[PDB]
């Protein structure tokens, strides 16, 4: 893992020592090459998971996320190349440094072996993301959005710290292999239930549960494009990954401590998907779509069947890529019309015919088009939940209908219809934007070709 | 579509509109042309039977009765002209009515393919540039002193001047591009 | 009813300009200045067929259970090619 971490660190010296002219090109290129290097973690020809040292490890669950993180950084730089067009060189380099630091910390987090590695490297992500939202955001309420994002997560996390310390005192260690191979059954004492909650709540907040999902619609419509991309591609999955790694010890309490959160997920999914129908902000609509998908992920993880885990992982990756693409597209139209309303710009298929194609493909990934890995994930989660209780199909079906509905609503409202001819400023699509969308789609298509890579530990 | 609606309508306009609508619905009911003529003549007879009524209160009551009868007898599925609002192919060609401001973004190599058309377009842009100042002043000076305004715009009064606010009226895409 | 004098004049002026623009839209004779048999059968029904039959025969079939087929119908008085068995006849009916 240290053949992937160190190049990432060295990106920073490159960013700061490069000449002002070539800095963007150099960092983008070397970040792509770091992404290439990260593929070495897919040479798992045996069931023995990789453990590169006492500190860093990898698994079938961590390799896809690490590779996704590596892949995102070049795309984040391309997406940020524009709105930073007229800032001073040091400020541009600061932005690039923030993104590089975010990648470093996230890779280390996903590759951490001890949960008190994880608890530090997980919260260290707050600083770069908070800076990205607050400093380079546009509208005034970005400060409030930053405050929400910081403190929701910190309130969630502190109880996680307490629980982890108790765990270490009780067990003697926090290496996840050791916890897995020496776990023991919890008893249904009230203190154990309180623990279960303390361990699970920070991750559930980062996987915004229906009742604690108010920090996404704000953080996203106040954050720049790169912030939104990294956030709702990787940060949101920190919660799922933590939950998956930590639930091993917290058994058998889950059987009855999951009813509340399963119910909240399976209801908030419908509520948020419906909210997407009548929202006048494209960024917000995408954010609430993300909330619904993470609701599904949470339900599956909290039922813990092999299908649940594998489908949850698949959908984690699929949502990463798809939501990222959607946000880049919306930012594309925003960079021109300088507004976030969906109603304002319409019929843009009459002037951006190809970007309309990318819009269509993204909407299909969102609505879950077979055989796309997005569908595969949702289908397998549905099978798991139906096994868990055969009545969940009602909620699942209502959500499927509404998902298709807002997914096509975006397209019809924006791409189709009479062109708002008064928009003189609409300019031909930049090769940068088109290449960004292509780099988002092509990995999705290749993984749909080869799903075996993105299955979880179970399958 | 080429004239702004009035603040209201008079008895004359309302009754004429009712006459047209009722005649078209009568036609929609009577498919055959001969039958349509037979009944449309009776319809004109009815309409003119009360043509000269100088008690406008009774006139309005008669018109209200006619309108209610119309709503009772309207064809559920009337006849709609293909391009008419609510008819098949109402907006069928709005996909290809791409505006003219897009040409400004054409690559010079694309403009090379059409040399003359763009020269003429450059002349047109020059003309518009020249005429904007005069036409804005014209509207400002022709604004009514009182606070009563109508959508209808003024014509060109001076000589060698384009009519006020003409760029959008002219240059609109061809119906069938 | 009827146009006002101002409306008539405005419509006439816009008419003139509209028709001038429409005539402007005409393309000149040089305007599109462009800058400087079984062939289908062989190259779309036979070339693909070689590749596809290669795949089928030398991969699909060579794998197990890839190409499975329902039993061919066997009737009385029917001779099996391989064993040589002759399936017996049918009892006569009145």
């Amino acid at each position: 893992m240290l053949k992937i971490i160190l190049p990432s660190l060295m990106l920073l010296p490159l960013t700061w020592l490069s000449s002002p002219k070539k800095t963007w090109t150099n960092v983008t290129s070397y970040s792509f090459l770091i992404s290439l290097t990260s593929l070495t973690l897919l040479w798992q020809t045996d069931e023995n998971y990789k453990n590169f040292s006492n500190m860093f490890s990898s698994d079938p669950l961590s390799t896809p996320l690490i590779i996704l993180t590596a892949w995102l950084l070049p795309l984040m730089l391309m997406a940020s190349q524009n709105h930073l067009k007229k800032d001073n060189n040091v400020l541009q380099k600061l932005y690039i440094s923030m993104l590089i630091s975010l990648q470093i910390l996230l890779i280390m987090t996903f590759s951490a072996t001890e949960l008190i590695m994880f608890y530090i490297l997980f919260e260290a992500t707050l600083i770069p993301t908070l800076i990205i939202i607050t400093r380079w955001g546009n509208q005034t309420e970005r400060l409030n959005a930053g405050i929400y994002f910081l403190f929701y997560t910190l309130i969630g996390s502190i109880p996680l710290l307490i629980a982890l310390i108790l765990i270490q005192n009780h067990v003697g260690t926090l290496n996840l292999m050791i916890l897995s191979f020496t776990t023991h059954t919890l008893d249904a004492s009230w203190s154990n239930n309180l623990l279960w909650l303390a361990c699970m709540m920070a991750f559930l907040i980062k996987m915004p549960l229906y009742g604690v999902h108010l920090w996404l619609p704000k953080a996203h419509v106040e954050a720049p494009i790169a912030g939104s991309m990294i956030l709702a591609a990787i940060l949101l999955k920190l919660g799922s990954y933590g939950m998956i790694r930590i639930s091993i010890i917290l058994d058998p309490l889950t059987k009855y401590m999951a009813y509340p959160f399963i119910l909240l997920s399976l209801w908030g999914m419908i509520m948020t998907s419906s909210i997407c129908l009548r929202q006048t902000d494209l960024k917000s609509l995408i954010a609430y779509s993300s909330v619904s998908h993470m609701a599904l992920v949470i339900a599956s993880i909290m039922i813990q069947t092999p299908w649940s885990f594998m489908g949850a992982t698949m959908l984690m990756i699929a949502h990463g890529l798809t939501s990222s693409l959607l946000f880049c597209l919306a930012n594309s139209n925003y960079e021109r019309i300088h507004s976030r309303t969906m109603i304002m710009a319409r019929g843009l298929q009459m002037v951006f015919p190809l970007m309309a194609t990318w819009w269509l493909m993204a909407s299909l990934a969102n609505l879950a088009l077979p055989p796309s890995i997005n569908l595969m994930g949702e289908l397998f989660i549905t099978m798991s939940l139906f096994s868990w209780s055969n009545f969940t199909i009602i909620l699942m079906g209502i959500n499927i209908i509404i998902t298709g509905m807002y997914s096509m609503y975006m397209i019809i409202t924006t791409q189709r219809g009479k062109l708002t001819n008064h928009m003189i400023n609409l300019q031909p699509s930049h090769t940068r934007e088109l290449t960004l969308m292509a780099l988002h789609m092509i990995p999705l298509i290749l993984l749909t070709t080869s799903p075996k890579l993105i299955t979880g530990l179970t399958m | 579509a080429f004239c702004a609606p009035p603040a209201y309508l008079t008895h004359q306009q309302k009754v004429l509109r009712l006459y047209k609508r009722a005649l078209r619905h009568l036609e929609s009911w009577c498919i055959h042309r001969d039958k349509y003529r037979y009944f449309a003549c009776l319809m004109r007879a009815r309409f003119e039977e009360h043509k000269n009524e100088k008690d406008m209160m009774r006139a309005t009551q008669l018109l209200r009765e006619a309108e209610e009868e119309f709503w009772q007898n309207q064809h559920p599925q009337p006849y709609i002209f293909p391009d008419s609002p609510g008819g098949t192919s109402f907006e069928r060609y709005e996909c290809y009515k791409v505006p003219e401001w897009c040409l400004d973004y054409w690559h010079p190599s694309e403009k090379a393919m059409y040399p003359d058309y763009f020269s003429k377009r450059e002349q047109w842009k020059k003309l518009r540039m020249e005429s904007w100042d005069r036409e804005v002043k014209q509207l400002q000076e022709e604004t009514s002193p009182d606070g009563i305004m109508t959508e209808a715009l003024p014509p060109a009064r001076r000589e060698g001047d384009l009519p006020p606010l003409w760029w959008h009226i002219v240059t609109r895409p061809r119906e069938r591009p | 009813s009827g146009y006002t004098p101002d409306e008539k004049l405005r419509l006439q002026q816009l008419r003139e300009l509209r028709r001038r623009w429409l005539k402007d839209q005409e393309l000149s004779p040089r305007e599109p200045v462009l800058p400087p048999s079984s062939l289908f059968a062989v190259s779309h029904v036979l070339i693909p067929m070689w590749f596809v039959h290669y795949y089928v025969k030398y991969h699909m079939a060579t794998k197990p259970y890839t190409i499975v087929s329902s039993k061919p119908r066997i009737f009385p008085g029917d001779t099996i090619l391989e064993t040589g068995e002759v399936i017996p006849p049918m009892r006569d009916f009145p």
């Binding site: 009459m350 015919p353 031909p428 | 059409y114 | 839209q25 005409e26």
Partner: peptide
């Protein structure tokens, strides 16, 4: 006879 049909820029 043949009239120019305006189109959005496709070169890009």
């Amino acid at each position: 006879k043949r009239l120019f049909v305006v189109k959005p820029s496709l070169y890009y």
